[PDB]
């Protein structure tokens, strides 16, 4: 079966695994910025703790009177500027790569509804809706139950994927450029998949684009990311990334043969 990859893990402190070149760039850039901001924070903290230890009233009974130090005041304006410029230098190329939409191998149009997602593959004339396993649409009321657990198991999951798993998945071929066009039907929703490094608001009246190329097969989950009412917590996203051949098989399963 498919490996569950794009999901949170117990006690996790880092990003979800990367499954796209874009997600990998985010991981690298955030790792870079984190080292810098940790250094800064540790620096500021050590300076404070030192000053308190060194110039505590029981140690230094006579305070100084200076209110200026030009060499230092220049250095602590200029150095933050350099650091920010360094961050920008690495950050802008990543941003440009994220937001420049390449040519699509697969095109999917996604619509956010209260409270579920609709998917259309215009090249394939496929259209379907995707509800949380446990949603009222599937007979539930947004909580775990013996039926919901059985439903999760039948669909290839476990009770651990509750709130992530949907009844239908957006299926795509591995190593192909997928362009997703996102809009909202009623209020604003937001479509995202952490493993791919993508997120785009689903705004009524607007069609926005994002892209990803998945680099391994498996199952990847996201969750609606703009508050949209009572079931905001209960309209997740499942993307299954499969072989070119398994993707065709899934397309044919949707093909109607009317005479």
């Amino acid at each position: 079966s498919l490996e569950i990859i794009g999901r949170p893990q117990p006690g996790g402190t880092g990003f979800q695994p990367s499954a796209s070149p874009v997600a990998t760039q985010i991981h690298w850039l955030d790792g870079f910025i984190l080292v810098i901001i940790a250094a800064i924070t540790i620096f500021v903290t050590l300076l404070i703790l030192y000053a308190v230890w060194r110039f505590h009233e029981k140690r230094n009974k006579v305070p100084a009177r200076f209110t200026h130090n030009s060499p230092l005041e220049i250095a602590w304006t200029i150095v933050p500027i350099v650091i920010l410029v360094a961050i920008g230098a690495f950050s802008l190329p990543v941003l440009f790569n994220q937001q420049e939409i390449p040519e699509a191998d697969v095109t999917v149009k996604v619509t956010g509804y209260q409270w579920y997602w609709g998917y259309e593959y215009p090249d394939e004339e496929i259209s379907f809706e995707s509800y949380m396993i446990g949603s009222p649409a599937t007979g539930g009321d947004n909580r775990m139950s013996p039926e919901v657990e059985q439903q999760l198991i039948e669909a290839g999951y476990s009770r651990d994927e509750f709130l992530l798993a949907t009844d239908t998945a957006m299926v795509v071929p591995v190593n192909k450029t997928v362009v997703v066009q996102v809009t909202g039907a009623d209020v604003i929703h937001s479509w995202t998949v952490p493993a791919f490094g993508v997120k785009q608001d689903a705004v009524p009246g607007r069609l926005a684009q994002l892209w990803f190329r998945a680099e391994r097969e498996g199952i990847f989950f996201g969750q609606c990311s703009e508050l949209c009412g009572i079931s905001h917590a209960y309209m997740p996203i499942t993307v299954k990334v499969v072989s070119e051949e398994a993707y065709a098989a899934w397309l044919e399963q949707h093909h109607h043969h009317h005479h």
């Binding site: 949170p8 117990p10 209110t67 005041e73 920010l84 950050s91 604003i188």
Partner: protein, 539 residues
């Protein structure tokens, strides 16, 4: 002679109005903090155990008490609307009715005139009206919670920023009440701002030149300008929501030719300045406090003034960093990213200047100083995660997750709020005539320090793991850090109840203040030359 209502609520004196804003801000603070305890009760464990739809069929009172005890999942039908209402209530109360009234309306009204040698505000009756508009706004925000709202229940579950079409489609009139509350808060802030500006410019004491004005009064002056530009823009944004809801307009409705994203631009044009309006008066307080307890004058007085001015101005040209995923062009994203990054420079000047103020001093670790030192460290933690978030490429991942929540609670609840406590402990002797017990101030500090860090630091982890904002429930893998966060919230709440006990004791049994200046000679601003409490009519 004067009854309690006349003595206090009818007073037009800046010191009395200041005290009214402080107590009220503290009371609304307690309410909003209580909401968060309940929030964190529900987030302690995956599955919904408290916010059950079954509690709606009982009364309002018995339904309330039922809500506080955990149910089995199989007996609890999740009610996402209650979650959304609590979250919205907590946020609106904090942002409009707690921290700014405490810092600007409270310490601002009290100390700014004292600091510049003014006997009162330019318009004392306007100042009194500002307070009443504040209370009226608070009353409406609170009333919205019990008014017909979304999903055939009570209350608005729309987020503190009221995004349409959600906010314009929410059923009932609870949302309209929240809009009116925000209008009344806005008016309150504008009236306050008119007073601060007129007083600061026209009523300084003989010899009190602009470059001799103390830093807190500067912080209040800068804050008032931001209010004048930011708050009328908000009044526009929300009036448009009200007309889309009630008067047939389609500003944000695509069917009528509108655009939901237009609201966001107008909203965040207020929404970013809003947070600098919050934190500037806290910068001011920290300056006075560090200088006093390091027994050393403030390092770089003029850069300190100009840094706050630069922060205030820059705060107006960065708003779309709240909109990176809302459909902004790559050009807009790049600009707003780079503009936002610039803010770290003047802010760093202040952080470094405060450390340089301590440097070579004679540092006394009294309670007010502990709060200021905590501020330096904790506001830095929050500020740097702000810079992370300004990177649109990384924000793609973090936006609408708990990493953002971690960011803003570090700068607000471990920053601005540490500023509030710094000021309270610094000035309670001066305002009341009674001093707080030192050991209890210190216990408060340490309980809050440990508790608030346990609450919010793990939210960074939750955000990196991809936990979204505004969720009643979450996937099981998020259990560990949610549980830790909740324990932190409960300890933090204990510290706050303790604090309220400290204030009660102080004001009833606290050692009487016997000196105009009960600190030291480096508390060198005008309030320290007056009695404790200052006379009814000063100067």
């Amino acid at each position: 002679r004067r009854g309690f209502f006349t003595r206090w609520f009818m007073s037009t004196n800046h010191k009395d109005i200041g005290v009214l804003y402080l107590f009220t801000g503290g009371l609304v603070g307690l309410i909003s903090v209580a909401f968060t305890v309940y929030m964190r009760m529900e987030l302690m464990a995956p599955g919904v155990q408290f916010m059950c739809a079954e509690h709606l069929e009982s009364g309002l009172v018995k339904g309330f008490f039922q809500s506080l005890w955990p149910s089995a999942v199989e007996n609890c039908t999740p009610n996402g609307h209650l979650w959304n209402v609590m979250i919205t209530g907590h946020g609106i109360l904090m942002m409009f009715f707690v921290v700014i009234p405490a810092l600007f309306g409270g310490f601002g009204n009290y100390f700014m005139p004292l600091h510049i040698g003014a006997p009162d505000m330019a318009f004392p009756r306007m100042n009194n009206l500002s307070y009443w508009l504040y209370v009226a706004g608070t009353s409406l925000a609170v009333a919205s919670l019990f008014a017909p709202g979304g999903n055939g229940q009570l209350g608005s579950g729309i987020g503190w920023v009221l995004y349409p079409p959600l906010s314009t489609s929410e059923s009932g009139y609870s949302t309209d009440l929240a809009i009116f509350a925000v209008h009344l808060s806005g008016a309150s802030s504008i009236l306050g701002a008119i007073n601060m500006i007129t007083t600061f410019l026209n009523m300084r004491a003989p010899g009190m030149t602009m470059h001799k004005v103390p830093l807190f009064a500067w912080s209040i002056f800068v804050t008032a300008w931001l209010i004048l530009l930011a708050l009328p823009v908000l009044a526009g944004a929300i009036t448009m929501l009200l007309t889309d809801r009630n008067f047939g307009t389609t500003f944000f409705q695509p069917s009528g030719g509108g655009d939901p994203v237009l609201y966001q631009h107008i909203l965040w044009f207020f929404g970013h300045p809003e947070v600098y309006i919050i934190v500037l008066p806290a910068f001011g307080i920290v300056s006075h406090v560090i200088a006093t307890f390091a027994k050393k004058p403030i390092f770089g007085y003029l850069p300190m003034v100009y840094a706050m001015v630069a922060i205030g101005v820059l705060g107006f040209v960065v708003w779309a960093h709240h909109m990176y995923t809302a459909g902004l062009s790559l050009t807009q994203q790049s600009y707003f990213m780079m503009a936002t990054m610039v803010i770290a420079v003047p802010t760093g000047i202040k952080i470094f200047s405060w450390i340089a103020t301590m440097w070579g001093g004679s540092i006394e670790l009294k309670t007010p100083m502990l709060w200021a030192l905590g501020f330096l460290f904790l506001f830095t933690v929050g500020g740097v995660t702000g810079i992370v978030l300004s990177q649109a490429s990384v924000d793609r991942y973090y936006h609408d997750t708990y990493y953002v929540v971690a960011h803003f609670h570090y700068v607000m609840s471990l920053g601005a709020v540490f500023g509030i406590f710094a000021g309270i402990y610094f000035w309670i002797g001066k305002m009341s005539g009674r001093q707080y017990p030192e050991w209890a101030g210190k216990l408060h500090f340490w309980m809050m320090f440990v508790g608030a860090n346990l609450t919010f630091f793990p939210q960074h982890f939750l955000g990196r793991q991809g936990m979204p904002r505004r969720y009643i429930d979450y996937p099981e893998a998020f259990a560990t850090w949610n549980f830790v966060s909740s324990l932190g919230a409960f300890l933090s709440f204990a510290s706050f109840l303790f604090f309220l006990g400290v204030i009660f004791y102080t004001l009833t049994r606290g050692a009487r203040v016997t000196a105009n200046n009960y600190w030291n000679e480096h508390a060198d601003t005008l309030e320290w030359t007056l009695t404790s409490p200052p006379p009814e009519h000063t100067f």
